[PDB]
Point group: C6
Chain length 192, copies 6
């Protein structure tokens, strides 16, 4: 996917943000967007094509893949990025609104807005972490037993590249925990 438009706005936010905010944006670009574009999209490229089920039943592989992977991980992480970035866009918009107001004519209202930004980022991060955990856990096993109609009885289905996907799942989990740490540290730094 093409992230150029998002990147320009985020950089604008970087100018009007704290040092730890700059660190968070750098982590976002280098360790989430770049890793997706360069590494992870390829890992999940053949998710359905190489998914194989031991049966002669038409349509069992499709329904079993759908049940095994209701949403693909990469799409989940795309949404995650977009939602953790949106609050920064809100804050940047408020900043530019006040700057344009001054033209017409961090403290105060902007400070409350920055705090709300931090809070929403933290909450969306925790939410996507918990969601991923409940959907899959943090380990994709090679065997998926499926009993979804039209499949007769239970069929064995085999996931492609399970170990590599587990590695990247844990990598992205770690990145999200790091970003949570950065947000908490930013709250501490501003408050005290």
């Amino acid at each position: 996917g093409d992230w150029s438009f998002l990147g320009r706005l985020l950089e604008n936010a970087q100018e009007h943000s704290t040092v730890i905010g700059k660190v968070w944006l750098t982590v976002l670009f280098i360790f989430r967007i770049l890793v997706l574009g360069a590494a992870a999209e390829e890992v999940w490229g053949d998710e359905q094509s190489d998914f194989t089920c031991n049966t002669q039943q038409p349509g069992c592989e499709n329904v079993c893949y759908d049940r095994a992977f209701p949403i693909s991980h990469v799409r989940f992480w795309v949404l995650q990025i977009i939602f953790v970035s949106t609050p920064t866009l809100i804050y940047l918009g408020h900043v530019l609104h006040l700057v344009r107001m001054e033209e017409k004519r961090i403290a105060g209202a902007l400070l409350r807005t920055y705090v709300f930004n931090i809070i929403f980022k933290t909450l969306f991060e925790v939410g996507f972490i918990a969601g991923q955990y409940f959907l899959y856990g943090f380990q994709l096993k090679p065997l998926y037993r499926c009993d979804r109609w039209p499949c007769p009885n239970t069929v064995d289905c085999f996931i492609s590249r399970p170990t590599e996907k587990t590695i990247f799942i844990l990598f992205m989990l770690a990145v999200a925990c790091v970003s949570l740490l950065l947000n908490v540290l930013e709250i501490y730094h501003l408050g005290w």
Copy 2:
């Protein structure tokens, strides 16, 4: 697809627009164009290839896929984006026309033009929502029973990635409702 040309014009409109207009444009880029380019096009990439029908009849899969999906959702959303953006282009063109006139030599005629922009955006949005609803509803079921010639009697056909497509259908529906809310809020803000 490449949206660079559309993006430059929309940003130009953003400079000569209200704060809520800037919010609407941001939603358009981040939550429609970026989601399509990064997430949804991949979901619908294997729509026909992985579409499977339980038959030995040549040409049944093609006709059944065509009847099940007269237009693909992603193409529908492309059209939707283009049409909800066109009124902004009209307003921006009127603005630049008046600015070039001044060079030669929001209120008044520009205000009526802005209102017409809002109205057309709202109407096109509602229209595409209702169209999607009547074509598919908001849930793609895995099984599609097809009785279209050359298919003999009724055949079972299985859609690929139905759950993920349902998720994104509802995501885009929500985004469109949000944009409707923004347009209504803009009318309220300007009027009162």
Copy 3:
């Protein structure tokens, strides 16, 4: 395909053109080039691969696809865009020629050149419309009966995505009619 080079020249023409010329260029970019790059190329991506004929004869599918689609629609529209844009390039070149002449040292010769531009645009548009109509009409039916050697007797061949292709055929036809209307309106505006 990459249209960046064409786009820069057309924008240059936009600066030295009438308001309706700017509208025509906007329609060209948004409703022809962008629709092709984002929507239509995908629709026609699997034209030959998913084309299926009910036979065991080697080479029948190739010859039957070739007879059914002598040129693909997308290529036709590419040519159409290029040819309707060329007159604008002629006019822009004449403009820059006269401007460079002035440096060395709309009315008059430039006006006749602009009229010729309009006329050639209209004629090429009508020509491509009539050509598309005689090749295919405006409806692609799912069944194509083919009797071309090596095919034995007549064979049934099934087109992929016929409904979506019909939808886009009619969309592009409508866009071309709109552009004809714009050209006629421009002639009226300049003349009177």
Copy 4:
């Protein structure tokens, strides 16, 4: 392929060139490079994959495709573009050499260099035309009879998309003839 680097140099040549030279460069970009990138590469995309021969012999399709198409047309046209553009690069380099000389410190030596540019362009154009003609003529027939080892006796092989390829072959031939006409006209204009 990516032609950005070539394009910048050619535009530089356009600044230091005659009006007819600007026309020739415009034709080169719009009617050769753009047509290849947007239309023709897709037509020849499935040249070997959809090439089919009526046999059960391993390796007959490969050798027969190789004999039928020693070089692909698109590659021929790439080479053609590069070679007809190289003389312009020579002339531009001579121009910049003399300009840098002046900094240190069309007529004369530059005029002879421009004439040599025109001559080499014309000769390379004629050469590529004649080469294409002797390789294929200007019509690709659907049936290719092949008797190359390992093929047993003569086998029937069927080319993919023959009519569309013939159409584009003739289109590019016409463009090259137009460019020859432009070069001859430029010689006439400069001489008299």
Copy 5:
């Protein structure tokens, strides 16, 4: 993958860095990023598709490929690049922090930060080298014998393009050793 964002930051670091730092960045771009984008990604493109195992057992190829290649080499090198580049980002951020401080109002704290940068680069490099070595060694043999369930007894599996992958493995190993040498030389140059 798209490395544009990383590249801009690294170039910024290049301005505020030693000559040997500039050499290291040049090696990073030319001999790691460019080689991946232009050469290696293609070599590993068909890693799983062309992976073949001599069996009729469903799912044996998937599990055997996963065990043979827990992570793909290209992804390993992507991570390696990102991690060896991160310390440079830290140092550049500290530099810009101090420059913005001066605006508000190599030696000292910046020198210690530069040393820490060098140390982390060296350690991450050694770590990725040792990791690659323990995973695969420096030679990919064509035959991989696999006894992972569901595979019955031990099955023979054949890797695609083993010699070319060995060549590139050794190329990247050499590049990493060169970069280690550069870091050690930089420590020597700064210290003495």
Copy 6:
């Protein structure tokens, strides 16, 4: 692959280089990088997929392709480009080092550095030529007889697009000879 980063540095070298150096860089971009990106990568795109061997033995095609093509030609040429360009990067770095030194505060040390650049370019060119020659010669024959285990006895394997690959092999050989000639001419020009 993406060569933008390499291109910017090489152009920088072009500013601080001789006329023949500018010719060499132009040849590098137009007749090596552009030909690869636009023509050759497509020719070698289906190298392994269309490689066919006359056998029923699992894994024979993989090992036979690996032995026939230890490295692919395109990758060889990528490496060749990178290595013949590296000396120019060295010289440019030395130039910028001295210019930054002057800021702090072709002849002499820069002249020796330029000569070393020329020498390394010539040696790397000769080395890659001889390497290609010993690996393949300058002709790829269609038939490759292979006796590598697991293949039973000797098997016949058929290369895809052998004639076109021979054509491009000879084209690139000619380009490299031309570049050698340019380097020798540059040595002569500087010396005398």
